[PDB]
Amino acid sequence: GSGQVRTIWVGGTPEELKKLKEEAKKANIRVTFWGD
Incomplete structure (x- = not known):
């Protein structure tokens, strides 16, 4: 289900x-930043 909130x-x-x-x-909105 689409919406504003995302990852x-x-x-x-x-x-x-x-x-x-x-x-x-x-x-x-959610953000998570990996040191990939």
Whole structure:
């Protein structure tokens, strides 16, 4: 079921650490950043 809340599996790219952290701040959505 689609919705605002979602989850990530990024390997801690500096760009994704910027953009998706902004989405976490902007939309309260889950973020978790692996040192993959």
